[PDB]
Amino acid sequence: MDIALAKRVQKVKSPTLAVAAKAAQMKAQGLDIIGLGTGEPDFDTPQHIKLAAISAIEAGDTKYTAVDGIVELKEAVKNKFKRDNELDYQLNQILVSVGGKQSCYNLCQAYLNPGDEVIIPAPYWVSYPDMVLLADGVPVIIETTPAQRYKINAQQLEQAITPKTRMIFLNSPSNPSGIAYTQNELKELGDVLKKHPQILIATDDMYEHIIWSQPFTNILNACPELYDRTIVLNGVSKAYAMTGWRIGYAAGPAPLINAMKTIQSQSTSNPCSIAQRAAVAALNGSNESIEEMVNAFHQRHDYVADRLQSIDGIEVIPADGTFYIFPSVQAIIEKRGYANDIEFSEKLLNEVGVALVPGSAFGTEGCIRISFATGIDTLKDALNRLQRFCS
């Protein structure tokens, strides 16, 4: 007999890591593949962070640590939230985790009960619904359009809330759209959320530093009165090109943070001790390397957006930040008679070798997520191929 799988894992299907595995596979066969599906910076970890990790290895920092992070890193997080976000957190409000993904997963396991509804704006990071489902929560998707710049409004939010709603993910700047809410937009959402006090607000600020159209702002900057029911989710993966090291961090209400620490203490223990020391050097160091990387993404974005605009049948909303852009190819799908954006993306990959992620993976049919965390020369080639495929 085959080993049966738990009912909870039968609820879930990760297509971003799956495209990555298919792209690596077809490159392994020797084919001419350009990967526009990546979810990490192409830049290496900055040298001063690498040097701090090497110093930690040489010093023998190879042991278990406090589950929620060495005190130097919890302090660096505390100071970062004050310095960058004008938010005051005590050490017992801070949890360092194995990537920001684990912050989110620990949150769901520490907080959500079976049947609880979680508002997830589309387009959404692929993992939000699956993490909710693994806690037996119920994803409640709010669909958005380009005319709304892929952002929910206060009337959509109120309409989606029920007496069963206990959480919302607010991810700004967004994976996959690259769009960020303005402070006033967050204020209008906060005014709705103030009317529903059982809703915990999970603000996923992972892409905070990767923004150029406006200064970063989150729900607590807009609505300080929501502090006691908000958890702030962040990490070093994107700002410091540290995706492989797996360090995220969160700040929020002490009882919730302690419950998340309890989940973590029974699942991973502390994150890698060397990675923790690397993250101290990142958070306490200069922003110079951040600015270098964000400037690169900005110039690449403007190039890609211009190329997409010029391709007949592709409609695009320019991003505010991140290394993603999220154009609609629905007109190409319709003129070709493709079934959907999965067929579009499979045909594109097999015809011209460009790998990207179908918009339906993020809950928005007919779009595609293009990542420009690759060199501008590779982007010129890839957009040439996309233009030829769509011609």
CB-based burial of residue 108 (10 Å sphere; 0-12 exposed, 13-18 middle, 19+ buried)?
buried
Q: Which residues ranging from 222 to 261 are in contact with ligand PLP (CB under 6 A)?
A: 235, 237, 243, 248
Cβ atoms of 213 and 320 within 8 Å: the answer is yes
By CB under 8 A, residue 283 contacts a copy of itself: no
Query: What tokens does 142 get?
Result: 């709010």
Partner in contact with 112, chosen from ligand PLP, a copy of itself, none, beta carbon below 5 to 8 Å by kind: a copy of itself
78 is in an annotated binding site: no
By CB under 8 A, residue 272 contacts a copy of itself: yes
Partner in contact with 12, chosen from a copy of itself, ligand PLP, none, beta carbon below 5 to 8 Å by kind: a copy of itself
Q: Which residues ranging from 23 to 42 are in contact with ligand PLP (CB under 6 A)?
A: 39
Q: What element of type H or E holds 325?
A: strand 324-325
Q: Which residue is nearest to ligand PLP (CB)?
A: 99
Nearer CB in complex with ligand PLP: 125/326 = 125
- In angstroms, the CA 65 to CA 167 distance is 31
x/- contact string, 125-154, with ligand PLP (CB under 6 A)? x-----------------------------
Cβ atoms of 118 and 166 within 8 Å: the answer is yes
By CB under 6 A, residue 321 contacts ligand PLP: no
Q: Which residues ranging from 98 to 117 are in contact with a copy of itself (CB under 8 A)?
A: 98-99, 101-102, 105, 109-113
Kindly tell me which residue out of 81, 212, 216, 245 binds a copy of itself, with binding defined by CB under 8 A.
245
Partner in contact with 192, chosen from ligand PLP, a copy of itself, none, beta carbon below 5 to 8 Å by kind: none
Partner in contact with 234, chosen from a copy of itself, ligand PLP, none, beta carbon below 5 to 8 Å by kind: none
Cα separations in angstroms, 109 against 71, 208, 341 = 25, 25, 32
CA dihedral 153, 309, 214, 97 (to 10 degrees): 80
Kindly tell me which residue out of 74, 78, 101, 301 binds ligand PLP, with binding defined by CB under 6 A.
101
DSSP string, 178-244: -----HHHHHHHHHHHTT-TT-EEEEE-TTTTSB-SS----HHHH-GGGGGGEEEEEESTTTTT-GG
Nearer CB in complex with ligand PLP: 272/331 = 272
Nearest to 88 by CA among 209, 254, 247, 281: 254
Place of tokens 């909303």: 317
- In angstroms, the CA 323 to CA 301 distance is 7
Question: Minimum distance between the CB of residue 145 and ligand PLP, rounded to whole angstroms?
Answer: 20
328 is in an annotated binding site: no
Cis before 139? omega within 30: no
| Chain positions contacting ligand PLP, by CB under 6 A | 39, 99-101, 125, 171, 175, 204, 206, 235, 237, 243, 248, 269
